[PDB]
Coordinates of C-alpha atoms in Angstrom, one line a residue:
Chain A
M956 CA 0.0 0.0 0.0
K957 CA 1.3 3.5 -1.1
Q958 CA 1.2 4.6 3.0
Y959 CA 2.9 1.4 4.3
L960 CA 6.0 1.5 2.0
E961 CA 6.9 5.0 2.9
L962 CA 7.2 4.2 6.7
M963 CA 9.6 1.4 5.3
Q964 CA 11.6 3.8 3.3
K965 CA 11.5 6.5 6.3
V966 CA 13.2 3.7 8.7
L967 CA 16.0 3.1 6.4
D968 CA 16.8 6.7 6.0
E969 CA 16.1 8.3 9.6
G970 CA 16.6 5.3 11.4
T971 CA 19.3 5.1 14.3
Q972 CA 21.2 1.8 15.3
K973 CA 20.3 0.0 18.6
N974 CA 18.9 -3.7 20.0
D975 CA 15.8 -5.1 21.2
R976 CA 14.9 -7.4 24.4
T977 CA 18.7 -7.9 24.4
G978 CA 18.7 -9.8 21.0
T979 CA 18.9 -9.0 17.5
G980 CA 19.8 -5.4 16.0
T981 CA 17.5 -3.0 14.7
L982 CA 17.4 0.6 13.0
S983 CA 14.5 2.6 14.9
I984 CA 12.3 5.7 15.1
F985 CA 10.1 7.3 17.7
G986 CA 7.1 8.9 16.6
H987 CA 4.8 8.2 13.4
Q988 CA 1.4 8.6 12.1
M989 CA -0.4 7.9 9.0
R990 CA -4.3 7.7 7.9
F991 CA -6.4 5.2 5.7
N992 CA -9.8 6.3 4.2
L993 CA -11.7 3.2 4.4
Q994 CA -13.8 4.3 1.7
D995 CA -11.1 3.5 -0.5
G996 CA -10.9 -0.2 0.1
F997 CA -9.7 -2.5 2.7
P998 CA -6.2 -1.5 3.8
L999 CA -4.7 -5.1 3.6
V1000 CA -1.2 -5.2 2.2
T1001 CA -0.8 -6.3 -1.6
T1002 CA 3.0 -5.8 -2.1
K1003 CA 3.1 -9.2 -0.3
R1004 CA 0.7 -12.2 0.3
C1005 CA -1.5 -12.1 3.5
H1006 CA -4.3 -13.9 5.0
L1007 CA -7.3 -12.8 7.3
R1008 CA -7.9 -16.3 8.8
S1009 CA -5.9 -15.7 12.0
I1010 CA -6.7 -12.3 12.1
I1011 CA -10.7 -13.0 12.2
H1012 CA -10.3 -15.9 14.8
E1013 CA -8.3 -13.7 17.2
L1014 CA -10.4 -10.5 17.3
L1015 CA -14.0 -12.6 17.9
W1016 CA -11.7 -14.1 20.7
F1017 CA -10.8 -10.4 22.2
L1018 CA -14.3 -9.7 22.0
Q1019 CA -15.5 -12.8 24.0
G1020 CA -13.2 -11.7 26.9
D1021 CA -11.7 -15.1 27.6
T1022 CA -7.9 -15.2 27.8
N1023 CA -7.0 -19.1 27.4
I1024 CA -6.3 -20.3 24.2
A1025 CA -8.8 -23.5 23.7
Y1026 CA -10.9 -21.7 21.1
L1027 CA -7.8 -20.6 19.2
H1028 CA -6.3 -24.2 19.4
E1029 CA -9.8 -26.0 18.2
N1030 CA -9.6 -23.6 15.2
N1031 CA -5.7 -24.5 14.6
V1032 CA -4.7 -20.9 15.5
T1033 CA -1.3 -21.0 16.7
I1034 CA 0.2 -17.4 17.1
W1035 CA -0.3 -17.2 20.8
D1036 CA 1.4 -20.8 21.6
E1037 CA 4.8 -19.3 22.4
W1038 CA 3.6 -17.2 25.5
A1039 CA 0.9 -19.7 26.7
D1040 CA 1.5 -21.7 29.7
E1041 CA 0.7 -25.5 30.8
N1042 CA -2.9 -24.9 31.1
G1043 CA -3.2 -22.5 28.2
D1044 CA -3.6 -19.7 30.3
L1045 CA -2.0 -16.3 29.3
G1046 CA -2.9 -14.1 32.5
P1047 CA -5.1 -11.2 32.1
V1048 CA -4.2 -10.0 28.5
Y1049 CA -6.2 -8.0 26.1
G1050 CA -9.9 -9.5 26.0
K1051 CA -9.7 -9.7 29.9
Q1052 CA -9.5 -5.8 30.0
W1053 CA -11.7 -5.2 27.1
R1054 CA -14.7 -7.0 28.8
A1055 CA -13.9 -6.9 32.7
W1056 CA -11.5 -4.6 34.1
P1057 CA -11.1 -5.1 37.7
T1058 CA -11.6 -2.2 39.9
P1059 CA -10.3 -1.6 43.4
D1060 CA -13.8 -2.0 45.1
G1061 CA -15.4 -5.2 43.7
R1062 CA -16.6 -4.7 40.1
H1063 CA -15.5 -5.7 36.4
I1064 CA -15.8 -2.9 33.7
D1065 CA -17.4 -3.9 30.3
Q1066 CA -15.5 -1.1 28.1
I1067 CA -16.9 -2.3 24.8
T1068 CA -20.4 -2.3 26.1
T1069 CA -19.8 0.9 27.4
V1070 CA -18.5 2.2 24.2
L1071 CA -21.6 1.3 22.0
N1072 CA -24.0 3.0 24.4
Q1073 CA -21.9 6.3 23.8
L1074 CA -21.6 6.1 20.1
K1075 CA -25.6 5.3 20.1
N1076 CA -26.8 7.8 22.5
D1077 CA -24.2 10.5 22.9
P1078 CA -22.0 10.6 19.7
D1079 CA -20.5 13.8 20.1
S1080 CA -18.7 12.7 23.5
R1081 CA -14.9 13.2 23.7
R1082 CA -14.2 10.2 25.5
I1083 CA -15.2 7.0 23.9
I1084 CA -12.1 5.2 24.8
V1085 CA -11.2 1.5 25.4
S1086 CA -7.7 0.8 27.3
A1087 CA -5.8 -2.2 28.2
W1088 CA -3.0 -0.4 29.9
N1089 CA -4.0 -1.6 33.7
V1090 CA -1.0 -0.6 35.7
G1091 CA -1.7 -2.7 38.6
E1092 CA -1.9 -6.2 36.4
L1093 CA 1.3 -6.1 34.2
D1094 CA 3.2 -8.4 36.2
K1095 CA 0.8 -11.2 35.8
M1096 CA 0.5 -10.8 32.1
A1097 CA 2.4 -13.2 29.8
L1098 CA 2.9 -10.1 27.7
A1099 CA 2.4 -6.4 28.1
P1100 CA 0.0 -4.8 25.9
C1101 CA 1.5 -3.7 22.3
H1102 CA -1.5 -2.0 20.9
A1103 CA -2.7 -0.8 24.4
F1104 CA -5.0 2.4 23.6
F1105 CA -7.5 3.6 21.1
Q1106 CA -10.5 6.4 20.8
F1107 CA -13.6 6.5 18.6
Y1108 CA -15.0 9.8 16.7
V1109 CA -18.3 10.6 14.8
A1110 CA -18.9 13.5 12.0
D1111 CA -21.2 13.5 9.2
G1112 CA -22.6 9.9 9.7
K1113 CA -19.1 8.5 9.8
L1114 CA -17.2 6.4 12.3
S1115 CA -13.5 6.9 12.9
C1116 CA -10.9 5.5 15.0
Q1117 CA -7.3 6.0 16.3
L1118 CA -4.6 3.7 17.9
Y1119 CA -1.7 4.1 19.9
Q1120 CA 0.9 1.3 19.4
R1121 CA 3.6 1.3 21.8
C1122 CA 6.1 -1.0 19.8
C1123 CA 6.0 -2.2 16.2
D1124 CA 7.9 -4.7 14.0
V1125 CA 7.3 -2.9 10.7
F1126 CA 8.0 -6.1 8.7
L1127 CA 6.4 -9.1 10.3
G1128 CA 3.7 -7.5 12.4
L1129 CA 2.4 -4.3 11.1
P1130 CA 0.2 -5.7 8.3
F1131 CA -1.3 -8.0 10.7
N1132 CA -2.1 -5.2 13.1
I1133 CA -3.8 -2.7 10.4
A1134 CA -6.5 -5.1 9.0
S1135 CA -7.3 -6.2 12.5
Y1136 CA -8.7 -2.9 13.8
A1137 CA -9.7 -1.9 10.3
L1138 CA -12.0 -5.0 10.7
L1139 CA -13.4 -3.7 14.0
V1140 CA -14.3 -0.2 12.8
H1141 CA -16.4 -2.1 10.2
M1142 CA -18.1 -4.4 12.7
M1143 CA -18.7 -1.0 15.0
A1144 CA -20.3 0.9 12.1
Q1145 CA -22.7 -1.8 11.0
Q1146 CA -24.0 -2.3 14.8
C1147 CA -24.2 1.6 14.9
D1148 CA -26.0 2.2 11.8
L1149 CA -23.3 4.2 10.3
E1150 CA -20.5 4.4 7.4
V1151 CA -16.9 3.9 7.9
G1152 CA -14.6 6.8 7.8
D1153 CA -10.8 7.0 8.8
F1154 CA -8.7 4.7 10.7
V1155 CA -5.7 6.5 12.5
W1156 CA -2.4 4.8 13.3
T1157 CA 0.0 6.4 15.6
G1158 CA 3.4 4.6 17.0
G1159 CA 6.2 5.2 19.2
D1160 CA 9.3 2.8 18.9
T1161 CA 8.8 1.6 15.4
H1162 CA 11.6 -0.6 13.8
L1163 CA 13.1 -2.8 11.2
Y1164 CA 15.3 -5.9 12.5
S1165 CA 18.6 -6.2 10.6
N1166 CA 17.8 -9.8 9.4
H1167 CA 14.6 -8.5 7.5
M1168 CA 16.7 -5.9 5.5
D1169 CA 16.7 -8.1 2.2
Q1170 CA 13.4 -8.9 2.4
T1171 CA 12.6 -5.0 3.0
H1172 CA 14.5 -4.1 -0.2
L1173 CA 12.7 -6.5 -2.0
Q1174 CA 8.9 -5.4 -1.1
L1175 CA 10.1 -1.8 -1.9
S1176 CA 10.8 -2.7 -5.6
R1177 CA 7.3 -4.1 -6.3
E1178 CA 4.2 -1.7 -7.3
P1179 CA 1.3 -1.5 -5.0
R1180 CA -2.0 -2.6 -6.8
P1181 CA -5.7 -1.5 -6.0
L1182 CA -6.8 -2.7 -2.4
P1183 CA -9.6 -5.2 -2.2
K1184 CA -13.2 -4.9 -0.9
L1185 CA -14.8 -6.2 2.5
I1186 CA -18.1 -7.9 2.3
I1187 CA -20.2 -8.8 5.4
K1188 CA -22.8 -11.7 4.6
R1189 CA -24.7 -11.2 7.9
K1190 CA -26.0 -8.4 10.6
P1191 CA -25.6 -10.0 13.8
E1192 CA -28.1 -9.3 16.6
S1193 CA -25.2 -7.4 18.3
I1194 CA -21.5 -7.0 18.5
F1195 CA -21.1 -10.3 20.4
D1196 CA -22.9 -12.5 17.7
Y1197 CA -20.5 -12.6 15.0
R1198 CA -19.4 -15.9 13.3
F1199 CA -16.2 -16.9 11.2
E1200 CA -18.1 -17.2 7.8
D1201 CA -19.6 -13.8 8.1
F1202 CA -16.5 -12.3 6.2
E1203 CA -15.3 -12.3 2.7
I1204 CA -12.6 -10.6 0.5
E1205 CA -13.0 -9.4 -3.2
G1206 CA -10.7 -8.1 -5.8
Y1207 CA -7.4 -9.2 -3.7
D1208 CA -4.5 -9.7 -6.2
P1209 CA -1.0 -9.5 -4.2
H1210 CA 2.5 -10.3 -5.3
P1211 CA 4.2 -13.2 -3.8
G1212 CA 4.5 -14.2 -0.1
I1213 CA 8.1 -13.5 1.5
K1214 CA 9.3 -15.3 4.9
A1215 CA 10.4 -13.6 8.1
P1216 CA 12.9 -15.9 10.2
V1217 CA 13.4 -14.8 13.7
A1218 CA 16.2 -15.4 16.3
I1219 CA 15.6 -17.1 19.9
Chain B
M134 CA 5.7 29.2 16.6
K135 CA 6.2 27.8 12.9
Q136 CA 4.2 24.6 13.9
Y137 CA 1.4 26.0 16.2
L138 CA 0.2 28.5 13.7
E139 CA -0.2 25.5 11.0
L140 CA -2.7 23.5 13.2
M141 CA -4.7 26.6 13.5
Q142 CA -4.7 27.1 9.8
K143 CA -5.7 23.4 9.1
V144 CA -8.4 23.7 11.5
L145 CA -9.9 26.4 9.7
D146 CA -9.5 24.9 6.2
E147 CA -10.5 21.2 7.3
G148 CA -12.6 21.5 10.2
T149 CA -16.2 20.2 10.3
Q150 CA -18.8 22.0 12.2
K151 CA -20.6 20.5 15.5
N152 CA -20.8 21.1 19.4
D153 CA -19.0 20.3 22.8
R154 CA -20.3 19.3 26.1
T155 CA -23.5 20.5 24.8
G156 CA -22.9 24.5 24.7
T157 CA -20.8 26.6 22.2
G158 CA -20.0 25.4 18.7
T159 CA -16.7 24.5 17.3
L160 CA -14.8 23.2 14.2
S161 CA -12.9 20.1 14.6
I162 CA -10.6 17.5 13.1
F163 CA -9.7 14.0 14.6
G164 CA -6.0 13.0 14.5
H165 CA -2.8 15.1 14.5
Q166 CA 0.9 15.0 15.4
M167 CA 3.9 17.7 15.5
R168 CA 7.4 17.7 16.6
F169 CA 9.6 20.1 18.6
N170 CA 13.3 19.7 18.8
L171 CA 14.2 21.0 22.2
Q172 CA 17.5 21.6 21.2
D173 CA 16.2 24.6 19.2
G174 CA 14.9 26.4 22.2
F175 CA 12.1 26.5 24.7
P176 CA 8.7 25.9 22.6
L177 CA 6.9 28.8 24.4
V178 CA 4.6 30.7 22.1
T179 CA 5.7 34.2 21.0
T180 CA 2.7 35.3 18.6
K181 CA 0.8 35.9 21.7
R182 CA 2.3 37.0 25.5
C183 CA 2.5 33.8 27.7
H184 CA 3.6 33.4 31.5
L185 CA 5.1 30.2 33.3
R186 CA 4.0 31.1 36.7
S187 CA 1.0 28.5 36.9
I188 CA 2.7 26.2 34.5
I189 CA 5.6 26.0 36.9
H190 CA 3.2 25.6 40.4
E191 CA 0.9 22.9 38.7
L192 CA 4.0 20.7 37.7
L193 CA 5.7 20.5 41.1
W194 CA 2.1 19.8 42.4
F195 CA 1.4 16.8 40.1
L196 CA 4.7 15.4 41.0
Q197 CA 3.9 15.5 44.8
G198 CA 0.9 13.3 44.5
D199 CA -1.3 15.7 46.7
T200 CA -4.8 16.4 44.7
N201 CA -6.4 19.3 47.4
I202 CA -5.5 22.7 46.1
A203 CA -4.2 24.0 49.2
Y204 CA -0.6 24.6 47.8
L205 CA -2.0 26.3 44.6
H206 CA -3.9 28.4 46.8
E207 CA -1.2 29.6 49.1
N208 CA 0.7 30.8 45.9
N209 CA -2.3 32.3 44.2
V210 CA -2.6 29.7 41.6
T211 CA -6.6 29.6 40.3
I212 CA -7.0 27.3 37.3
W213 CA -8.2 24.5 39.5
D214 CA -10.6 26.4 41.5
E215 CA -13.7 26.0 39.1
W216 CA -13.7 22.0 39.6
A217 CA -13.1 22.3 43.3
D218 CA -15.4 21.2 46.2
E219 CA -15.9 22.7 49.4
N220 CA -12.8 21.2 51.4
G221 CA -10.7 21.9 48.4
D222 CA -10.5 18.2 47.1
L223 CA -10.8 17.3 43.4
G224 CA -10.9 13.6 43.5
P225 CA -8.3 11.1 42.4
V226 CA -6.9 13.3 39.5
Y227 CA -3.3 13.5 38.1
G228 CA -0.8 13.5 40.5
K229 CA -2.5 10.8 42.6
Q230 CA -2.5 8.1 39.6
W231 CA 1.3 9.5 38.7
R232 CA 2.5 8.3 42.5
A233 CA 0.0 6.0 43.9
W234 CA -2.4 4.1 41.2
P235 CA -4.6 1.9 43.5
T236 CA -4.5 -1.9 42.6
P237 CA -7.1 -4.5 43.2
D238 CA -4.6 -6.2 46.0
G239 CA -3.6 -3.4 48.3
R240 CA -0.9 -1.6 47.0
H241 CA -0.2 2.0 45.4
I242 CA 2.3 2.2 42.4
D243 CA 4.8 5.1 42.1
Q244 CA 4.8 5.4 38.4
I245 CA 7.3 8.3 38.2
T246 CA 10.1 6.5 40.5
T247 CA 9.5 3.3 38.2
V248 CA 10.2 5.4 35.3
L249 CA 13.6 6.8 36.4
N250 CA 15.0 3.5 37.5
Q251 CA 14.0 2.3 33.7
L252 CA 15.7 5.0 31.9
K253 CA 18.6 4.8 34.6
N254 CA 19.2 1.2 34.5
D255 CA 17.5 -0.3 31.2
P256 CA 17.4 2.7 28.9
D257 CA 16.3 0.6 25.6
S258 CA 13.0 -0.7 27.0
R259 CA 9.8 -0.2 24.9
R260 CA 7.7 0.3 27.7
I261 CA 8.7 3.5 29.8
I262 CA 5.3 4.7 30.2
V263 CA 3.1 6.8 32.7
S264 CA -0.7 6.5 32.5
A265 CA -3.6 8.3 34.2
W266 CA -6.4 6.8 32.4
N267 CA -7.4 4.6 35.8
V268 CA -10.9 3.2 34.3
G269 CA -12.1 1.9 37.7
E270 CA -11.6 5.5 39.1
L271 CA -13.2 8.0 36.5
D272 CA -16.5 8.5 38.1
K273 CA -14.8 9.7 41.3
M274 CA -12.9 12.4 39.5
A275 CA -13.9 16.1 39.1
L276 CA -12.8 16.0 35.6
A277 CA -11.6 13.0 33.3
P278 CA -7.8 12.9 32.1
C279 CA -6.9 15.3 29.2
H280 CA -3.4 14.6 28.8
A281 CA -4.0 11.0 29.7
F282 CA -0.7 8.9 28.7
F283 CA 2.8 9.5 27.5
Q284 CA 5.9 7.5 26.9
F285 CA 9.8 8.0 27.1
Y286 CA 12.5 7.1 24.6
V287 CA 16.5 7.4 24.6
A288 CA 18.9 7.4 21.5
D289 CA 22.4 9.0 21.3
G290 CA 22.3 10.4 24.6
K291 CA 19.1 12.1 24.4
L292 CA 15.7 11.9 25.8
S293 CA 12.6 12.2 24.0
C294 CA 8.8 11.8 24.8
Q295 CA 5.5 11.4 23.3
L296 CA 2.2 12.8 24.6
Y297 CA -1.4 11.5 23.9
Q298 CA -4.1 14.4 24.4
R299 CA -7.6 13.1 23.8
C300 CA -9.3 16.4 23.9
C301 CA -7.7 20.0 22.8
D302 CA -8.8 23.7 23.0
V303 CA -6.4 25.0 20.2
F304 CA -6.6 28.6 21.2
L305 CA -6.9 28.7 24.9
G306 CA -5.2 25.7 26.2
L307 CA -2.6 24.3 23.6
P308 CA 0.3 26.9 24.7
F309 CA -0.2 26.0 28.4
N310 CA 0.1 22.2 27.7
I311 CA 3.1 22.3 25.4
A312 CA 5.4 24.3 27.8
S313 CA 4.3 22.1 30.5
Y314 CA 5.6 18.6 29.3
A315 CA 8.5 20.6 27.5
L316 CA 9.6 21.6 31.2
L317 CA 9.3 18.0 32.4
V318 CA 11.5 16.3 29.8
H319 CA 14.2 18.9 31.0
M320 CA 13.9 18.1 34.4
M321 CA 13.9 14.5 33.7
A322 CA 17.1 14.6 31.6
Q323 CA 19.0 16.7 34.4
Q324 CA 18.4 13.9 36.8
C325 CA 19.4 11.4 34.2
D326 CA 22.6 13.0 33.1
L327 CA 21.2 13.2 29.7
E328 CA 20.7 16.1 26.9
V329 CA 16.9 16.8 25.7
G330 CA 15.9 15.5 22.5
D331 CA 12.4 15.5 21.0
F332 CA 8.6 16.3 22.4
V333 CA 6.2 14.5 20.5
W334 CA 2.4 15.9 20.5
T335 CA -0.5 13.6 19.2
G336 CA -4.1 14.8 19.7
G337 CA -7.6 13.6 18.8
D338 CA -10.5 15.7 18.9
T339 CA -8.4 18.8 18.3
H340 CA -10.7 22.1 18.0
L341 CA -11.3 25.8 17.7
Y342 CA -14.6 27.5 19.4
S343 CA -16.7 29.5 17.4
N344 CA -16.1 32.9 19.8
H345 CA -12.4 32.9 19.2
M346 CA -12.5 33.0 15.4
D347 CA -11.8 36.8 15.5
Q348 CA -8.7 36.2 18.0
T349 CA -7.7 33.3 15.5
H350 CA -7.6 35.4 12.4
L351 CA -5.3 38.0 14.4
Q352 CA -2.6 35.6 15.7
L353 CA -2.4 34.2 12.1
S354 CA -1.5 37.9 10.9
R355 CA 1.8 38.2 13.3
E356 CA 5.1 36.8 12.4
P357 CA 6.6 34.2 14.8
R358 CA 10.0 35.3 16.6
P359 CA 13.0 33.4 17.8
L360 CA 12.4 30.9 20.9
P361 CA 13.6 31.7 24.3
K362 CA 16.0 29.6 26.5
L363 CA 15.4 27.8 29.6
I364 CA 17.9 28.1 32.2
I365 CA 18.0 25.7 35.3
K366 CA 19.8 27.3 38.3
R367 CA 19.9 24.5 40.8
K368 CA 20.6 20.8 40.4
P369 CA 18.2 18.9 43.0
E370 CA 19.2 15.8 44.5
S371 CA 16.2 14.2 43.1
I372 CA 13.0 14.8 40.9
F373 CA 11.1 15.3 44.3
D374 CA 13.2 18.3 45.3
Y375 CA 12.8 21.3 42.7
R376 CA 11.7 24.6 44.0
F377 CA 10.0 27.4 42.4
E378 CA 12.9 29.8 41.8
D379 CA 14.9 27.1 40.1
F380 CA 13.8 28.0 36.9
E381 CA 14.3 31.1 34.4
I382 CA 13.6 32.2 30.9
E383 CA 15.9 34.4 28.6
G384 CA 15.3 36.1 25.3
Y385 CA 11.5 35.8 25.2
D386 CA 9.9 38.8 23.4
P387 CA 6.4 38.1 22.4
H388 CA 3.9 40.2 20.6
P389 CA 0.7 41.3 22.7
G390 CA -1.3 39.4 24.9
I391 CA -5.0 38.6 23.7
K392 CA -8.1 37.4 25.9
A393 CA -10.1 34.3 25.7
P394 CA -14.0 34.6 26.6
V395 CA -15.6 31.6 27.8
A396 CA -19.4 30.5 27.9
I397 CA -21.0 29.1 31.0

């Protein structure tokens, strides 16, 4: 996509050298922001071949608030295996803060349900926010939130959303990350009788790993093609009732897939 | 300043009409980002006359974690009066989450002290974060956080910081807000034996009130002048030991002050 390639090129030109969680080297920059007009097509990268099968399964998992990987395992999704423990538990990660944030007085807050009430009854509010950065529960998580916080916004019958990403692997994770939220805005709009607007991406320590350099030079040499189109075959009775088969992509025609080797 | 005037002009060109907390009209945009190289001078607006007296007093107040307005009252600071109650209490606002975030198990987390330990012992971490958005305690606050979350970053002996602002009055509050954090980065660096880098600003529902239009057209017609310079006369034994008189500005030469009338 026109906007994803520029970040890549900017990291190469302005990035500084350094390391990560103490392992492989990187080139990094601090602070970036891009915009995707959802009306111009689903923002799924075409400069390399990608799939939405794991992306879809993970989201419906987040929405249900469970944090054990059973559901992901039934369907053959293996992205969270690396961090899961013996019983298949991961601690109070995303879905748990999204649907039942623990207070100091005895309650569990449903932020998703709160958010739909607001857009539906008071669309001009300046605090339709969802957070997963719960200071008091970080040490119990298997992994501190990366896509940590996002806000919603309404104007002229269109829904928009801005996400704050603290850490981001430009080559291996950025593509996965962008289509994920892109999907949520869509699902949110349908349940709110509204057209989709912009998806705003903001990041912090944005980087490229040295053993991805060759793969990067290669993607930068292929021309981006037209974005595909999302199709929603059904209209669930609510945001908690979507099923795998409700989604379908059209007009997607990517270049060939490229591998991403990681160190351990 | 070169960058503050452009936002102003962009709100006028691309802003949409609407209202606020149900009162005065506005023109607004969603999603913006700017950068200030601190090495090029203190970013205190010169296109209108401003003061740092309240700005300084408020910060030292945040750092001490108290939320009652006594200290502000001793020194004749009146910006928080509007929201304070009969005993001078405001609920668990900023300073309280900054120095003693309540957990669900019985402890209070000192995020500021945690943050200095990290930059000092593990400067390449990707999670040197401070949050004030404590879902479980919003309903007890007199005002939900506006400058809600910020992250720190180190590279080539320079300290940088990015802030996420959910709501922002471009004409009345933006100037106050920018010099405030600008000051903190400086104080943070001194205590961390480091040079200051960039201050990155990111916002959401950024707006201009209709009864500020005339004042805006006026500022846009004056030429910005050289930024002044911050001077720190003393080197406290820690981040909790700074005093009012430790700071001093030089070379500041603004145009004339302009008033901002508000509705009730």
